[model samples]
Target chain A: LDLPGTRILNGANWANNSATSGTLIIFDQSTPGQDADRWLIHNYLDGYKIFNMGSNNWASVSRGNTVLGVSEFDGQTCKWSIEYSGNGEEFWIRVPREGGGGAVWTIKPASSQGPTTVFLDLLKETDPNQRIKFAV
Target chain B: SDKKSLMPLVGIPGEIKNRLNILDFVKNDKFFTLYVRALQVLQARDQSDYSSFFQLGGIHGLPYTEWAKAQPQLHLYKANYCTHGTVLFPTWHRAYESTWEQTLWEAAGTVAQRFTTSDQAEWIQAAKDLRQPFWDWGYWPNDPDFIGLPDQVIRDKQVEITDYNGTKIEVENPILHYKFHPIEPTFEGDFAQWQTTMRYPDVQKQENIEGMIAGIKAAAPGFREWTFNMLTKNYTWELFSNHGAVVGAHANSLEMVHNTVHFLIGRDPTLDPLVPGHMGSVPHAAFDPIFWMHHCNVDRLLALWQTMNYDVYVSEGMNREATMGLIPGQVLTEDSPLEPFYTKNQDPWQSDDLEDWETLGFSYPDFDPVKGKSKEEKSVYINDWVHKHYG
Candidate 1:
């Protein structure tokens, strides 16, 4: 409901541990029992570096990330959303975290909860070393 | 005349392969021989007007497909954009020349070993008379990835320059995986801008000739010893001195004008025909086979200048771009045209283009001490037993 012609929902449940060591996951929905489509989280314990991911991984990702194709991207915000292109309708749920730990994933109304604890670290903010950026 | 022109081909293939194997014999300084031999082939070919077969339209318009089809050796590797076509041009061409030189040395060694036979010398010269169908178009002998692979592991892949238009080009899928060092923006931009600005001057007959001579003289000694003498010793001052003259004299005059000088010299990578009117950019000229031969000679001349006269060579006459923004080095791209060739200043040059010493074309030269052995005095030893058993 954040914009016209779009819908947002949270994941069904936090049945799995979904939590890992040294890393935090924030689920945007609070509904304890819902379908799997509401929200999901995957977290990495250590920060990500371009060199470690794969060969020329950073450049490849950067090339694909931007719409206009600038060929480099800076990972600033810890939030990423997947859009459903059906009927030209799309909406995303936001998961704000605390100290790289689990946070909230609720419906657009802010009070409506779908999945309580599906964890993920959309952006690894704990490791300040991962803040570097490159210009294309 | 056809036979004379075709004789280069007859001598080319075996010569190229021998040149490749020479790296094993000399232990070092192979790149010198390889480099020198390539220039000889290129210069001779230039003299022979062999490029007529590759023409399309203007020098820059030479079709990548035609070049690719002609050279089967190039069909084995990948290029900058990862496609198997045009990008292989520079590296493979260098490989062809290097291979040719190795073939010559091997033949010479074989003849020396079988000196008792009356036909030994004839066999040696005959071996030198063969050629490959097309020059190699896509082999990077020094790519760090191929460091320890056996000789047979090398392949021939063709890469085409798909980005003919000025639009953003992408390497959709790469055949190989490796790290590519960042070339500074200033280094890329400065040369391009300079080329664009120099166009009018390049058009004016007198200034163009003067600038060409100055550029050549600025790096003469190395060119004389490494490139000229090593290739064929038939050096033409006019060819080196006049950029347009050298390019304009080819059999396919227009093609030569475009690829040899316009694209090769400027190192432009754009492929759009519209570029000449809008942006002077063309597809990467480094992707062309002739680019390496031209530049290797250029590097040899630079080396000579560095060795012969220190003061005149080292002293700054004018300032161009010195510092490049991306790489952590002095701005050799902005302020001074006389850039440093050392590791920090120019890693690619200092590392000798990441090639094996022999492959880089210094025959009879000792890498440890960094000197050369004369072609006439050196004794080449080929093990006949091994070839007899192996073949």
Candidate 2:
């Protein structure tokens, strides 16, 4: 297959701080210190541990509540909901693993107030199986 | 159905018999309260089930199915006496009227039912004073003052019947009065200017013309389906010409929805209301006085639907966000909270918002939901699924 133009890179390399893409999953919230990196981990944990929401075929890492990883599906987006499971500790996303394995992100209700969208992307490494991952 | 169309006023004149006054409805806190309560019920009903065949992309299955089920239960009218169109128009009218009167009573029943002697005397007098002559606000053709010509002048000009091989055939010609009814040339002002004003990137491109042509072609089949379904669907045929607000507002809402959705989807959009085949699409200009009565009538039908089919409401799949790629906060849902306009709350009711349905005080009809057939069908020709699906 013809390689995508330089301006349009695959999700794998793009998620690993690669300059090949302008598409970055940016999170906007009232909190200032909470940046893309911080929310990234929240996304990862929710995907991997809580909902088992992601496919196992991708590289993944988690720093905190967020999760980020590369997947078989490159640009698909997923969403899930989790109602608070008491103790005010866990939250829910409405739908789970939307758009299949390669989805890029999912937005879900984080609190009783509404939902916050979480994003995911594939990492790049020539070894089709090996890719970078991070979470905050 | 054609015969019924002749009764544009539906036996009730356009003017309100009671001068109860729009301002009076606005001023009374009780009116607002009842109105909001009615709307809330309406939202619940719609949410309870997706009754609208239109929501399902015009597929004509479930709606027909439901109709078949209700056919037996429907109060039958003797075809001989009730033969307005072999569909029992008078029976449907009676039922429709009964349903609305019931809805108004239910919504304001406590006030309507249990007035003290003093309150009864005061309201009775007030209701009496409110009576006024009826007027036809819809104002299509048939105005009495059109150069002393018969009321049928416009309708007569639009079509002509001729004998063909021992059979009568109806044919459509370019309607007369180019100055009044917009001709092909008038379309240039609406869609054409829209392109230039917005300076669409593809506006000048051949691709734009090709795209417009393709979109129009694609829409044709769907439009035909809609037209046929409208003509054959018993409920729609019974109501559009007979019921007040439902047809008028329904027409207007359909137009607004098309314009709004097109605006959202089109690469470049303009403020023009002209879209091909949108003449029948609803507009305030088309409905000033008739609009309110039509809505009042529509509200009544919805109330009837609630009683007939109580288990159904809209499925989220039919929502714009799911079906049309609408972004939340960008496009509104019927359930979206809005400020009522002309009410004490200052919240205007948006037809698009789902939440507004609740103010109507009824649940959505219980029926299967699906994108309807692309073309319209008459009420009589509708299948069981459509009758079952939406009110």
Candidate 3:
């Protein structure tokens, strides 16, 4: 299913993993109705651009840092492409580098004291932490 | 011009020389004829006949099962010493292009002699004048529709040809495919599947030309600045040669730009599903005719940088020890012989021997952006060049 204008909830718990502007993006499971959790995922050229509905900012991977943050669209960092595997059950959200090399966005599960963090990681198929599932 | 070392001329008109699309370049009688003949000549030779052509791309044979064995120290495996992920990438290709040019030139001469028309003398002259044209992938022109992979390369499976008898016929496009000869048994898996030149392969169905154009458009502005700055501000051989990941060094912007073009054009369906490698993949790339023109542009950019900062970069940087890969201490000086590529006489081509384009016997027609008076002016000129050429 196309994801534009939809909220991406963690498939495990239906918890909202909002893409909000400013600071690092963490799994905000309790903030279900918060506008930050609502994302406007629109088709951007060949890839997709995810925007934080609350901040009116686009999601970006911080330069040289894998941390995900929301920022003004600067052309490159905010753009992502979806990679399907396992007969389309698994998807990889890839952020392409301007000069060629790129990293895939993966979700690290919640720690004991902190919410799950979404950041850029090396593309891995077997890692459950990196596998992402979509929700309407 | 020094008669001994003069590079053969690429006789395109000045107005369109730097801006010809693939169709324009391939449609030109001189270019098309020469290219076809060269491929025919290269294909006719077995691994034993012309070891150089196979060596330039790669081959599958033992130390001697292949016509002739390359020096053991060259360290060439299935893929001969076409340097990748190494500091010698730029220099090695410069030498490779020159050697390929020599082979093509010889083929053109043979093609010229077989001409039967009144224009036989003219064809002979044209053959001598033919030089490989560079494809400027980032040339953004004033026209919005100017960019993207040329349809001639992307779609055409066959090409129309005119022979010595003035009869035009259709042939499997040499530019579109190169059939493997004496198919090496050692080639296993994906390499064995290659029977002919396969460009984008199955990826063409997934990615369109417009997508490629958008990718280039998105990256061109930043890439242009990054490239100009790498040459003018951070004038180090390390930054200009290979993929640079070091701080303050935009790792080989030229190489990076070059790689993007390869992957976009040669996206294969079999490799990484997300980013399949085809002609863009190093080992399989040289088989495609586009590879030569692509490398021509890559070499031209290096030449342009050298022209802009001759003393500061070329002279000083050329001698610096290349610090990449398994090599302990390798310097890209004039004396460093690039592995495998040799002159017509079979003398190993050294970096110093290819240091000067004038000595190589050919030179690029004037490119104005690198000629700017100031670094800022050059950057501005490049932006204009990109828009004018590819936009």
Model 1 CAPRI quality: incorrect
Candidate 2: CAPRI quality band? incorrect
Ranking by TM-score: 3, 1, 2
- Listed models, DockQ each: 0.01, 0.03, 0.01
Q: Compared with the real two-chain complex, what DockQ does model 2 have?
A: 0.03
Instruction: Show where candidate 2 strays beyond 4 Å.
Output: A1-136, B1-279, B282-288, B321-391
In model 3, which regions exceed 4 Å deviation?
A1-136, B1-23, B51-55, B59-80, B142-144, B203-234, B245-252, B268-275, B313-334, B343-347, B367-391
> Model 1, range B1-391, lDDT digits (tens) per residue?
0111111211122222222222232232222222223322332332113232111111222112222122232122111111111112222233333333343344334333433445445434543432211211112233333221121111112212212122223331211111112221322433333321222124321113234334333333322232223222213222222222233442221122223333222322333322231112343333233233343333333233223222221111111111110111111111121111112222112122322323343422111233343322221111221122112
Go through the candidates in order and give each one's C-alpha lDDT.
Answer: 0.24, 0.25, 0.55
lDDT of 3 by residue, B1-391 (tens): 0121222222222222232335467768766776676776776677545434554455211212222333222222122346554456677787767666767767777888897988788887777677777776654443444553454555567766678877787766666566777554655555566666555545433334445445556655555555555455546655577664232244545676677678766663235454442465664567677787888778877876665555433221221121111111112334444545445455446556666554664666545435427655654565555444433
Candidate 2 lDDT, B98-187, residue by residue in tens: 223233333333332333444455443332222211111111222232221121111233333222122334332222111211121223
Which is superior by TM-score, 2 or 3? Answer: 3
True contacts kept of each: 0.00, 0.00, 0.00
Looking at candidate 1 chain B, the ten consecutive residues that score lowest on lDDT are: B321-330
